[PDB]
Amino acid sequence: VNSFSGYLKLTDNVYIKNADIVEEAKKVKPTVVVNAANVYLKHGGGVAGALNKATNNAMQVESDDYIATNGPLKVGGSCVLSGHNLAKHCLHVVGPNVNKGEDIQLLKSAYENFNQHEVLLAPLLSAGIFGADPIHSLRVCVDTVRTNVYLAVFDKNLYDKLVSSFL
Ligand SMILES: O=C1CCCN1Nc1ncncc1-c1ncccc1F
Ligand SMILES: [Br-]
Known part of the structure; x- marks a missing residue:
């Protein structure tokens, strides 16, 4: 049992909610929040800009040090950094x-x-x-992720479309 609330169950391990990931993180304080990053960890807009704003730019400061030490990520890659006030x-x-x-x-x-x-x-x-294509992304998610994933989709019209078209 975990503390995510109001999610729709899509599969054994994937759940979805029409919500801002920032607000879900502020409520749940999850062990891990995922950022939709770019290779330079430049968090200007989209999900990244929204998360970074909610950390008062601390995410960006930490990211700049990460890049200065390690160089850019790969497309398809990842790194683990602090969740600041949003998550571990x-x-x-x-x-x-x-x-x-x-x-x-x-x-x-x-x-x-x-x-x-x-x-x-x-x-x-x-x-x-x-x-x-967001329908494609959800399909890849369900067919690739085996751990327990709670997907927050901010756009209401998209959330409704994603649920109604899910196979
Ligand atoms: O709705 C969708 C579908 C793909 C990305 N996206 N956006 C979000 N998804 C979850 N939480 C927050 C946002 C978000 N909110 C405000 C500004 C910018 C943002 F990216
Ligand atoms: Br976006």
Whole structure:
């Protein structure tokens, strides 16, 4: 038993809610919140901008030190950093950004990072301003992640479309 509330059960291990991941994190304080990162950990907009804003830019400061030490992530890769006031840890995961022309096949690799954590609060990778088909992203999630994932989808119309079209 865990403390996530109001989620719809899609599969054995995947749950979904129409909610802002920031507000879900502030409520649950999960062990892991997933950020929809880019390879430079530049958290300007989308989910990343929203999470970073809710940390008062502490996420960005920490990320800048990470990049200065380690260099950029790979598309499809991840790193674990602090969750600041939102969660114990933040798993920064880089899905492919179709609006940058990146290879959507890397989306499966991106979701594989979730399997290193028993439970996660996550956004829909590569959707939104990353330009991929959100129905496809949800399909890849369900077919790749084996650990327990609570998906927060902020856009109400999208949430409704995702539930109604789920196979
Ligand atoms: O709705 C969707 C589908 C894909 C990404 N996305 N956005 C979010 N998803 C979960 N929580 C928060 C946001 C969010 N909220 C405010 C500003 C920006 C944001 F990205
Ligand atoms: Br977005």
